[PDB]
Amino acid sequence: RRDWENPGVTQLNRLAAHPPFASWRNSEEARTDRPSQQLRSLNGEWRFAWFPAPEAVPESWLECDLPEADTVVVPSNWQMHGYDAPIYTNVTYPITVNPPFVPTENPTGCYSLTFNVDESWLQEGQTRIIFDGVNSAFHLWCNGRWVGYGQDSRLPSEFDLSAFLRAGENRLAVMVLRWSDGSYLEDQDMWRMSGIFRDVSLLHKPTTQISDFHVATRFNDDFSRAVLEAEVQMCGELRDYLRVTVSLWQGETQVASGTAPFGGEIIDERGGYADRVTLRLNVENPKLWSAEIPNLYRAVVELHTADGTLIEAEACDVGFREVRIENGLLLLNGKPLLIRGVNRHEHHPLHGQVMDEQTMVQDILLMKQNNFNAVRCSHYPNHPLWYTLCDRYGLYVVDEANIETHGMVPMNRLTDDPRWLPAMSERVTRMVQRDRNHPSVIIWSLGNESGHGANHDALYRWIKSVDPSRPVQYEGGGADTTATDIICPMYARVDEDQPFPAVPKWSIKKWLSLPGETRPLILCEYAHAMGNSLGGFAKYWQAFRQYPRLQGGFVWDWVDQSLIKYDENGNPWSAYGGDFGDTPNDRQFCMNGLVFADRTPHPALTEAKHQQQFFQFRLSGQTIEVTSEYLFRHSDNELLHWMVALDGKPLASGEVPLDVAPQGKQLIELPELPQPESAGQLWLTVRVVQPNATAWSEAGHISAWQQWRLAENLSVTLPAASHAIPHLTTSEMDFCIELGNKRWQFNRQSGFLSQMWIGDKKQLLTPLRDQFTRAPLDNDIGVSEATRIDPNAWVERWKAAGHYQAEAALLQCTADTLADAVLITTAHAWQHQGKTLFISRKTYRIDGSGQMAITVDVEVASDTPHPARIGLNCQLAQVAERVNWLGLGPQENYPDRLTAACFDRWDLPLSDMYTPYVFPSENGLRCGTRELNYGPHQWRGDFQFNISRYSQQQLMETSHRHLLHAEEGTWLNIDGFHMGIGGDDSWSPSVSAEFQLSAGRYHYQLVWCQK
Amino acid sequence: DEANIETHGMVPMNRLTDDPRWLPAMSERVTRMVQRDRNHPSVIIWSLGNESGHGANHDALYRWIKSVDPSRPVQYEGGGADTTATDIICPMYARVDEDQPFPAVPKWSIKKWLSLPGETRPLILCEYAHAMGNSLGGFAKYWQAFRQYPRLQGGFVWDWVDQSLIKYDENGNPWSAYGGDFGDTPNDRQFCMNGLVFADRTPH
Amino acid sequence: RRDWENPGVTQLNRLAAHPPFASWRNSEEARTDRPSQQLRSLNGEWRFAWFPAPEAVPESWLECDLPEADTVVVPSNWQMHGYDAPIYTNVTYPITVNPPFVPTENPTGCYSLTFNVDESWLQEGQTRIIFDGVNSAFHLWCNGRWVGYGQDSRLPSEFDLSAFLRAGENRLAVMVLRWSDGSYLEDQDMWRM
Ligand SMILES: *[C@H]1O[C@H](CO)[C@H](O)[C@H](O)[C@H]1F
Ligand SMILES: *[C@H]1O[C@H](CO)[C@H](O)[C@H](O)[C@H]1F
Ligand SMILES: [Mg+2]
Ligand SMILES: [Mg+2]
Ligand SMILES: [Mg+2]
Ligand SMILES: [Mg+2]
Ligand code: NA
Ligand code: NA
Ligand code: NA
Ligand code: NA
Ligand code: NA
């Protein structure tokens, strides 16, 4: 029997699902949540052996250990141990579409564990084993005897071993199959791995036991009063003296309690549940749970004799909160949420899909520290501890079924098929039964990218039926189907309609007001953070803030799915699709996070932090108006820091305590500001600082900022009179300019400044030349394969237009001598195949002061695709340690992604000026720069620039950051103009029109000089 | 057209139908009936089964049908006759004028039933007028009510033909047998004969 | 595998359900509803033998007729031929309530049919067998070969025998279980056959 090829069979002998248990035999321990003697981890070293197929597994293995087996850690993904390659496929199934069949060649991991059990366990009650995560299906044997089977890689599979075990030494044998019929339901956009990847354990329950419990909180009109209802079920002989006591604690204070014998109310003609009972506990002025104030209580469920003897106790944390959609708004505790979310897979660059607390905690804190308040379990129920952490630190969670059939044709091929309803239902039901008591979980989701089938409808109703406390959403088939309480599209744009057939993605603002539509809209995915991305992020926020029913969304996504590999000399590097011989593959498309796999942030994180700020500011004269977007807490750990500077030079500064009630306002008037008579721009910057530490942040933490330009005093003063007057020396091939120790040289054949010297030091390795292209961003590439070309992608368009290959054609080059200067005038034509793409016209004006002033005017053919940038570039001979500038920063910032950055005086190590995106592209840009200083060089004007040891060409030819090599000297890219980077999606052009270089005529000017 | 699902003997009645583990088996009993009979014009209403209390399985299956075949109303009497798994108030044995206020699953008078606050559905009895033996007394009363109230749209009498079986005596003569006649026990004796006609189709 | 005690298994290898087909190869006949050559009845005389439990059934049966069997009409209810007794219970299940388990003593009707098929059937196309109603669960074998399993006493259970059939003489062996996990969903107020 090939059960792994029968969606009709998803388990055998498996126990029913339930909420997390520990069988504590001491109430006190349960209360304190101390560890339970009844719950043992079998995590650690296990025996493992790999086979190409299950038929290759040796019968002996069941009775005895294979000498050839190795000793490995569990949990783990075998690919992480090197047994076989991890595969990175997106939509396309990693195996042949032939449901419910799987390949004959099906990697099989045979696991085994030798262990002991004490008689105690054995002499009375129940001994069961729990496999938190097994990928994708598996058979289990104990002491040579087969126990059962299980499917669904993302939920615990449980079996009773009571009758398999013997005092002392026991042996587990787990035959784990890489693929199965459950795989047709596990087509998520991630690495395809396998193994015993989540905890293994053993739990002891008494014969008379708590088999299930449901915790509910209902409130009065103003939440000033609550009723906690606890439904408790038992297994065991039914007896009159049996009782249940449910007690509620706030810290060490017991706030409520109730006890009762089993026997629920009459429910139908045949009676009620004699094995159940419901406790109702009244709670006055309960402390409510939210992500802003994760207040929790402890619920302790005791199963005991009337007369006092405790049989066992189970327990959980409880968050009193109400989730509800009313009049088109998702409310929490009666207030409308504004979701600052992120999608997050369970990914680890070293361990793969194994999740540890450390990592979890870390993810949580960065998210909180970055203004996120919610997370989506893309696209499967997560490791148990995750929910507990969310409960405690405070995050809103979308709990999602492990059901993704994206590779099908059409997408709802299985979900619309009744024959698959059973396997699907279990993916939904068991999730619910497991996580229904976590307050963090506020919405249930039916899975992902599985089209829309009758099955979804059934399942949707099932949930609503069993747990009315939470809304249910699902994006499949159009995002606004009958199977979802929220309009939850992926990648719908703010203002821009994408009217695909059957499943259009309307402008989010238009979507809300479609006739008959009334639901709230929360994007299940938006702002694809792939590489140099997140352009247009603020646009979403502004809309979320203006329209009440736009209650936010979940960014796609949290961390890059990169895996660490090693080179010939044991140095580690970041790998993506195909880097393991895996094919077909989807290359870098598994890398779309705000942070790198090691959790180091991408520059975009900051953009996200800013836009998601919880405090809003307006300036009027010297009064700042602070508005609070907190729904529940007052600004009780916040201070306002302000500062005024003139061109980077600090004039004044102060700090003000924030005292803003949620949704409230606070006006802050600044002291008269000092008056400088000195020319330039005064800038005001404000930062909200958290004086004290929290469980998720260090004291001094900065949570919000904003900047404004105050007065400006135009410099009317005249530069100082120059003693010298530079000299020009002509030759047929060049024009040379000389002033003191400085000289410039311009090639007459090419029309460029080809050399500059300080003293006798040349300053350039490559001539200063115009630049209209960039090493393409992932967003510029979109899908566009080389086997498969997408003609509408930017890169493709640029490529086809010859942008990357046009050659400069000199139209003119001349020299004039001024009163106080030499003037070089040039003109070039950029053509491709007889087409004039661009025209550049310049003048170089060097005066007796040694300042070279470059004025540039370009023309762009209206019928050529809008160029990536309009600037100049050159390779400097020099390599300096720092880069100092007067403009936006300090981090990388692009035109459509620069709100977070601040204008000021920045000074970093050269290296911070490069963004080590794993898939290399244009990066490190800084906008709104008025002054840039490198080594003895200094540039002035109003531009954007980048500077690194890497040319655009290298960047463009290398696909892995580890393969980059510093070139001689430093490449400088100075732009008068730079195209937006986009990112509404990473597979169609996404740069908004306002950020495209379509004006046709461009002008800029810079002053190059020394210091 | 009614799904093959009846869990009458459970305690409480919805013990299985409300358990997700039984959703799969149950699902097939409905889905498969629909796939088979859906082109039949005579079938005008789908039933989720009989006497299985009211469980979440019912709701999901209810929805599966609505979704798959919107051409026909779906009914189910279990758990009260007016739950969320039924488009028609379809009680068994509710009386005309007399209320029988059973706990949890009362059988209101049908006329009163229709007008309960917020109730708007049509009401058609899945079973009424138990024709067991010398019976059918008060039949007219239903008819008068069905005729006067628009939303009282009729019902299905219980039931058509006596479930008696032929047995032969020593002298090989036949005779109608019922519960217990075959050594069968426990048994419900004459309870299997509630028809308007005898087993051989001769009318009562 | 005691598939009849696992509500997780309600069939094995069963084809998908669908409306009544006849596979006509002529439009006029389909229109007029005439009988169709592609659809053939196996009702008639079959061979039968009664056992008290699935375990009492001998393997011989799979390969060959059981001398002890009788020739009976099909379709039929074995309680009507005297093999065992019909049961009349209303609410209380006819078996002990302990889902998904059934009694160890569980009456088994071993049915069999020797028959032939047109060669052309063998040649090309698909040949499936359709059982309109089997109470309550059954295992099916063709020419010794195990074909599949089915539950739900009131809907047709269909199997492809394209691969099991053979030139001329074929033998079907149907092992039918009185009780099954299906019985828990079949508690209707009527005779239990
Ligand atoms: C939304 O799309 C992103 C694109 O990278 C991933 O494929 C997610 O799984 C999908 F739900
Ligand atoms: C309605 O009750 C009658 C009583 O004879 C029958 O038992 C039916 O099966 C039930 F639906
Ligand atoms: Mg299977
Ligand atoms: Mg997908
Ligand atoms: Mg079964
Ligand atoms: Mg009944
Ligand atoms: Na909003
Ligand atoms: Na992706
Ligand atoms: Na590249
Ligand atoms: Na009427
Ligand atoms: Na009856």
UniProtKB/Swiss-Prot annotation, chain A:
PANTHER family: BETA-GALACTOSIDASE. It comes from Escherichia coli (strain K12). GO terms for cellular component: beta-galactosidase complex. Mg(2+) 1 binds at E404, H406, E449. PROSITE patterns: GLYCOSYL_HYDROL_F2_1, GLYCOSYL_HYDROL_F2_2. GO terms for molecular function: alkali metal ion binding; beta-galactosidase activity; carbohydrate binding; identical protein binding; magnesium ion binding. SUPFAM superfamilies: (Trans)glycosidases, beta-Galactosidase/glucuronidase domain, Galactose mutarotase-like, Galactose-binding domain-like. This is Beta-galactosidase. GO terms for biological process: lactose catabolic process. Belongs to the glycosyl hydrolase 2 family. Changing H345 to D/F/L/N: Less stable to heat than wild-type. Causes significant destabilizations of the first transition state. Disulfide bonds: none annotated. Its EC number is 3.2.1.23. Pfam families: Bgal_small_N (PF02929), Glyco_hydro_2 (PF00703), Glyco_hydro_2_C (PF02836), Glyco_hydro_2_N (PF02837), LacZ_4 (PF16353). Signal peptide: none annotated. Its cofactor is Mg(2+); Mn(2+); Na(+). Homotetramer. Inhibited by phenylethyl thio-beta-D-galactoside (PETG), isopropyl thio-beta-D-galactoside (IPTG), L-ribose, D-galactonolactone, lactose and 2-amino-D-galactose. The active site is at E449, E525. Na(+) binds at D189, F589, N592. The keyword Acetylation does not apply. The keyword Hydrolase applies.
Curated annotation (Swiss-Prot), chain C:
Substrate binds at N90, D189. Changing D189 to E/N: Causes a significant decrease in binding affinity in the absence of monovalent cations or in the presence of potassium ions, but only a moderate decrease in the presence of sodium ions. Changing D189F: Obliterates all binding and catalysis. Na(+) binds at D189. Homotetramer. Belongs to the glycosyl hydrolase 2 family. This is Beta-galactosidase. The lineage of its organism: Bacteria, Pseudomonadati, Pseudomonadota, Gammaproteobacteria, Enterobacterales.
